[PDB]
Amino acid sequence: KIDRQMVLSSRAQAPVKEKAQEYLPDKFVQQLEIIGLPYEEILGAISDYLMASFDRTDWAARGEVDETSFDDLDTALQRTWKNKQRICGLTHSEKSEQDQGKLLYFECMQFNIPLQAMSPPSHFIPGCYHILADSLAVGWHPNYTTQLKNKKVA
Amino acid sequence: KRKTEVPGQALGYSLQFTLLTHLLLQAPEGSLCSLEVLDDVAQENNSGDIKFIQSASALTANPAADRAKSLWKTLSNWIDLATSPDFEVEKAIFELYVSRPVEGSIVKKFNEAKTPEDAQEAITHARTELWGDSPHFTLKDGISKEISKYVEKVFTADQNLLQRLICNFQLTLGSGSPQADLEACVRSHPVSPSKVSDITNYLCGKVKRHIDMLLEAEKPAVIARDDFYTWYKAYVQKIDRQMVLSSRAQAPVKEKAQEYLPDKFVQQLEIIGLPYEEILGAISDYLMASFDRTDWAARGEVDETSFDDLDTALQRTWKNKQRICGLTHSEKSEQDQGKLLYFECMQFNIPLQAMSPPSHFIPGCYHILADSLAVGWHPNYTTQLKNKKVA
Amino acid sequence: KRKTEVPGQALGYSLQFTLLTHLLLQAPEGSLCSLEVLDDVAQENNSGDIKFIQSASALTANPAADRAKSLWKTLSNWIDLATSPDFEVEKAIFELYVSRPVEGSIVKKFNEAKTPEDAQEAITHARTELWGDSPHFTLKDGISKEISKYVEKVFTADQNLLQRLICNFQLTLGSGSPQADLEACVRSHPVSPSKVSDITNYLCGKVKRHIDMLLEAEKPAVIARDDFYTWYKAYVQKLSSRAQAPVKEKAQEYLPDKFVQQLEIIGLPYEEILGAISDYLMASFDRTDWAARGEVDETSFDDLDTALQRTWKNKQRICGLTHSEKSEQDQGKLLYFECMQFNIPLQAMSPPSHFIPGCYHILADSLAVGWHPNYTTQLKNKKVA
Amino acid sequence: SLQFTLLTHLLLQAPEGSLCSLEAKSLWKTLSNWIDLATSPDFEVEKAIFELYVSIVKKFNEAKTPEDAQEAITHARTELWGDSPHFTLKDSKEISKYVEKVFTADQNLLQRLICNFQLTPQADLEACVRSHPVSPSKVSDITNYLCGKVKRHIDMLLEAEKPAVIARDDFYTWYKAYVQKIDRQMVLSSRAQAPVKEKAQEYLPDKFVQQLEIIGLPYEEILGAISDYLMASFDRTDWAARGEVDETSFDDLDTALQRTWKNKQRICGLTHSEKSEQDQGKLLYFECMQFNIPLQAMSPPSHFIPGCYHILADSLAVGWHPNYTTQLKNKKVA
DNA sequence: TCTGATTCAACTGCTGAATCAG
DNA sequence: CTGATTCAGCAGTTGAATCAGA
Q: Can you give the residue ranges of the ABC-three component systems C-terminal domain (chain D) (predicted)?
């Protein structure tokens, strides 16, 4: 009551259940499973995609976030992706490529960063993470592109 | 006090700026609030309605009296303005602001005469008290020289014009201090009570500054309501910020700690074999975090939606940390993994509403989530709880 | 416009508040600045000085002209003030603040006069120009009725009293906008030039409102400049990069630097040295830009460098001890990237996403820090080969 | 020293102009370089304002006007060069060269120069800084920083054979920027100094040094630790002394640090149990030396958290070895 | 007995208009 | 053709003394 916000309080609702199966053929998905990632949190990340995209459109339409904020946020997030990618590639090389991919995914999802000095919701970071995964901007598997090409034929 | 200094009448002009600021704070969107353009203060809204004001800073004398010079001069001036051609008198909502609560039969009847017949009655009362019964007008010769011309112009003007002028005439009168009657208006806004005394005297200063810079260039002094609210919001974003949350919880006594031992989170802690002192510290952190949550929600320090976001963030971090913990230290006993998980989330921190929480708030919230079985430290914490609830 | 409104006359009273604020900003320590108490605007210091100021908002007139109601009324009023039996004029600095920069034959003589003998010649010129020659006073009857009484009171008053009043008289012209000379006073203080308006808007908001609240209670309107500066400091106490990405051709010129020597000491896909050199350039430009235009102190840069150096040292020890079961090739890149994931803020302000790695690169160009377990020994090894 | 202090004072009392101030051969030489520097194409004498803090000099002050400046220069040449047609007073060459440079230079430029030739030390500078909208506690720090920076900027020009001139708009871009760091609370400034080497060994028998030597750190690490100890203790004293920090904030910081120890020691011990206990202590030391938390949402110096850990170690509130309680007792006997 | 309205005298504010000096 | 005179008519309401009403 009688509070004040001046922060990215994204207005969104529970995503439609069918869209979870609808977005299954999406590129970020077949980036995901190829590291042995289970289907339940696959659906969770799919939902996170849905609300994250809806909130991105909401901010772009109504207007609370400058355009350069998304760009430099994603640039920093991609740099962090690559840094942790190499970190897990070296310090965890003494085991399977599958587990390397899943540990990279886990250790990357914990990252947080403010936007315009203000805190986004907890679901936003995985959403932009998988958005980068959509356009080959980030990858969880150490050789993700090769396995993506292999699975696109099978 | 010398005669060469006039503090009481300089306030008669300062009150114009104060009333301009208050009018801007009350003005609808799309309006222009002008100072000495159409009247002492004025407001022209989008629909073309013009609202005049005749500010009258009364400290000692009464400008609303029946035979007051100021009231009758103001009414004569407004009837002259209504006489002007191409004037839409319906929209011209006048006002005689007075800095103190004033009384008077004529002025009160004028103020309360919404209906044109009520206005006819009010003007009849004023004419009877100032001139006498028609048509002899036995009291006409006795009226004051200063009031004579204004009385003549008001009473002998067109009947319909005076009727409407009195219909939309008002006596909006504030408390003894209009400045303190203006700060209250800012307080009524959704503004932090600590920052009202800063927003008010930034808005007044900006209004005075802009008006001065307009009138030194001979241009008509007018502040757009859109501009005023743009400055208002831009300053509110700047100044309305709180930085550090101070916890008001107290460390519980040792005796109270054992009352919570049968709680689920204590069971989870002793499943992975934490020592007794660490368990007691956990009870203390639980109590402080719960009290902090309840208090901050109660007194508006932190919104409940902020607590929901915090809880979701803690759950997300806990699951992301548990999954990596279950594979980086897999070559150990499950109790060791539970200690690692619990301690790593113990070290973790995250701000609430972009504000740093106390050192015990996050551990206590994690214990809250453990109590509700939302999270867990042991890898098989649910199975261990089920097994231990039977033994 | 109609004659029932007086905006230009309202400026005569709003300039009271404006000049009160402008006097408060420049008030000597321990002064009480008052509005419509001793004069239009006054300032009293601890040494007993008072500075009466008859602010005039000249906009379509000339209050400092030779024959004006304003100037002579002001001088007669000050002579009346000084005629009081409890008021010495040795500390009675007067002022005739005018909104416009105006000049007059007599007001200039009064303003430039500083010594009693010069002031005597000033009054002699004033009498000669207005009353006329001393014995005849031919123009005395020509002097206007409005000015006659005031000029009579000025000239017939005590000769030494008027002499010292003219000596202490001062003409302080504005610049056409008294509100843009206040902001000039504010921007001459240690405040961000982007925030100069925000202070100036707020300060007058105090200076008006408080004074207003002090007159609405029928009390003297005096602001203690200590209180004004209390509000001022309490208000004052309550990063962006402009380094564009360098062209690829400019990147190769930095290859001979020891910075690139280290990056590849422990090797590192050259797909690196391009990004590393880019970060080097952006940080190098950002440091100089922020130092010059002014957003971060240079001592702040020194402290940031010290913090990154200590973090590099501790991270080097940690990485070596933990990952000693690896070849130096691995430990080098492990120290590297972990050091590049350090997120200290610059003087409590969050730097852009590249600033910290770039500053690490800048420090690594020197001999201080490097991302290799034994980078010092191999520095010469690669240099010889 | 005074030349670099009154220069700062004059830089504070100057509106948007170029500035300079120096300390008879001495009187004439400085104005000779002033006229040479003014004749440089970039200089604008109108905005320039000089100073010669310590009859002809009195006239130089008294002018404030091109005609009065011409009169003062006329007095000067009449006094120093004798009769104009003959110049019999020409016969000391060292000063005479500067007089030739000055009196034969541009009449308009020198005439404008003499107008700005004002004449004229720490207490008044401090008062002038105090009169600005800055906290009264920070005035000494700002004064010292400004004097140091002005000295540094003048010396770098002097070594490069360049005229000694400081622009006021170049002084305030330093001083306003410093205020943002120090006046606004967001940053803590450490007034503590690094201890000398000799005084450091006096703290060798202290308990935190014993702890670190039990962990077997190199001899430079313990010296750095002692320096952090002394500097952080000085900062603890001074921050509370001047009210820049509160005691409850110190209590909260110590609570957070103790909680950090609790997590880090257990995690290092059970995660690196296979490593030797001394290596576990070194790992714990270097891992918790990475911790940095704002003190009152206010960034501390990079050494302050290590020094807080060192004072906690001196009171045994923190420790690096897993069984350092037994190790200290064992070493106290040997 | 005092709060209050009434009649008037009265300090301040500086623009507007017709006229006039250089 | 700008600037200065001369006078004028708005505004600001308070201050001081007198009378009407409880």
A: 208-327
A10 falls within a domain? no
> Best of C314, C323, C346 to disrupt the D interface by mutation (most D CBs within 10 Å)?
C314
Count of domains forming chain C: 2
State whether B77 and B217 are in the same domain.
yes
B216 falls within a domain: yes
Please tell me whether residues C21 and C67 are part of one structural domain: yes
User: In this structure, are residues C320 and C209 in contact, taking their beta carbons and an 8 Å threshold?
Assistant: no
Is the domain of B281 the same as that of B184?
A: no
Contact D186 C348 (CB under 8 A): yes
Q: CA B309 → C1' F1, Å?
A: 74
> Which residue, of B211, B239, B267, is where some domain finishes?
B239
Domain end (from D154, D182, D210): D182
Exposure string over B116-146, b if 16+ CB within 10 A, otherwise e: eebbeebbebbbeebbeeeeeeeeeeebeee
Give, in order, the Cα–Cα distances in Å from C321 to each of C305, C318, D276, D279, D282: 24, 5, 11, 8, 9
D39 and D125 share a domain?
yes
Contact D120, D53 (CB under 8 A): yes
> How many CB atoms sit inside 10 A of residue A38's CB?
11
- Asked how this structure was determined, the answer is cryo-EM
Report protein residues in contact with nucleic acid strand F, where contact means CB under 7 Å: B 1, 6, 8-9, 11-13, 15, 40, 54-61, 63, 69-70, 73, 77; C 3-6, 9, 61-62, 65-69, 102-104, 142-147
Q: Say how far apart CA C157 and CA C65 lie, in whole Å.
A: 21
Query: Given C6, C16, C177, which is nearest B10 (Cβ)?
Result: C16
| Residues in C touching D148 (Cβ below 8 Å) | none
| Residues B299, B209 share a domain | no
CB distance D217 to C317 below 8 Å:
no
B356 contacts D266? CB cut-off 8 A:
no
d(C-alpha C166, C-alpha C154), whole Å: 11
Q: Where would I find the beta strands (DSSP E) of chain D? A: 18-19, 50-51, 117-118, 166-167
DSSP three-state, residue C98:
strand
Count of structural domains within chain A: 1
- Chains C and D are in contact, defined as 3 or more C-beta pairs closer than 8 angstroms: yes
DSSP D283-331: HHHHHHTT----SSSSBPPTTHHHHHHHHHHHTTSS-SSTTHHHHHHHH
Resolution in A: 3.3
A to D contact (≥3 Cβ pairs closer than 8 Å): no
Could you tell me if residue B2 is inside a domain? no
**What would the 3-class secondary structure string for B116-183 be?**
HHHHHHHHHHHHHHHHCCCCCCCCHHHCCHHHHHHHHHHHCCCHHHHHHHHHCCCCCECCCCHHHHHH
User: Are C141 and C253 found together in one domain?
Assistant: no
Determine contact, residues D114/D70, Cβ cutoff 8 Å: no
What sign has the CA pseudo-torsion C13, C15, C16, C21?
positive
Closest CA to C202 of A58, D244, C210, D323: C210
Compute the distance between CA of residue D96 and CA of residue D118 in angstroms, rounded to an integer: 23
What domain range includes position B308? 254-388
Question: Whose CA is closest to A59, among A12, A10, A13, A14?
Answer: A10
- d(CA A88, CA A13) in angstroms, rounded, equals 35
Strand E nearby residues, CB < 7 A: B 3-4, 6, 9, 61-62, 65-69, 102-104, 142-147; C 1, 6, 8-9, 11-13, 15, 40, 54-61, 63, 69-70, 73, 77
Say whether both D164 and D25 belong to one domain.
yes
Let me know if residue A1 belongs to a domain.
Answer: no
CB B368 within 8 A of CB B258: no
Q: How far apart are CA D322 and CA B112, in angstroms?
A: 86
Task: Name the nucleotide nearest B10; use CA and C1'.
Answer: F12
Task: Return the residue matching tokens 């919001």.
Answer: B233
